[model samples]
Target chain A: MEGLNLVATALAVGLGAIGPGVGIGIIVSGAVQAIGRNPEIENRVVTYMFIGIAFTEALAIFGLVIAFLIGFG
Target chain B: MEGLNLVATALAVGLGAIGPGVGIGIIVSGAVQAIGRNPEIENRVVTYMFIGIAFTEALAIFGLVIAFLIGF
Candidate 1:
């Protein structure tokens, strides 16, 4: 039987935690808290949070991409 | 086979997109809702919307890079 490269596969999956999750979490929490504290500022807070989340997620996705290169390239 | 590895690579990258896609969806939905309720801040909301979109699009670019790594 041929053995699979568990290490490489793990690398791919493990590195997956890099961006989108963290970004989204932070954004949501911030928005929620802001809204809770100041209902009037909900609009601005949510928008800024979204922007922050997106940019943060981009970094994470880039990390996953690098993992792919390392594993397969 | 070379073709087989390439296909797997494509799948890997394709799946990577799911998370970011859903994330942006939520962000946009929220932004739209906020704008709808507060039309007075249309200009400010729109500016933030673009910034958010750019940030979201960047994740998609990450998917593209991974695809290239896999396919090339």
Candidate 2:
């Protein structure tokens, strides 16, 4: 494949999504389980989970952006 | 154009680090919160958290390896 650069760019974005996707799933799963067990701290647990999600998702955003930049530049 | 590969490789690893870093952070934070709430179950929470961490961090490791292979 002479256009291997294209492959690399695609892989950058594609593979990048894997971690954050699973990471968020894991976080949410654990959070739900925790909240289920203790309903009193629901607010606190949710807030923390959201924070975690934002950070984890940022990685995917960065990868997608960087992949585009690389492909275009 | 020639150096695009390098850029992609760097992005792969750099971007890769963010998820697991934050993921592990989140996992630990949750675990700590859990332990704080119920000190007696500290052992169980910590063990489970570590397991989560290992799985999450594996993604970063995969990304790093992919970057290296691509770069070289």
* Deviating ranges (above 4 Å) for candidate 2: B1-11, B14-72
> Candidate 2 — number of clashing residue pairs?
0
| Candidate 1: regions farther than 4 A off | A1-62, A65-73
Pick out the ten consecutive residues of candidate 1 chain A with the lowest summed lDDT. Answer: A1-10
**Kept native contacts, fraction for each prediction:** 0.03, 0.10
CAPRI band of model 1? incorrect
lDDT of each: 0.55, 0.67
Error of 2 at A27 (Å): 0.3
TM-score of 1: 0.59
TM-score of chain A of each: 0.64, 0.87
Question: lDDT by residue for model 1 over A1-73, one digit each (tens)?
Answer: 1112323433363346325643564465446444544668867777687677657666665666666565664
Docking class of 2: incorrect
True contacts kept of 1: 0.03
Residue A9 miss distance in model 2 (angstroms): 1.6
Tens digit of per-residue lDDT, candidate 2, span A15-37:
67776777677777777777666
What is the DockQ for all candidates, taken in turn? 0.10, 0.21
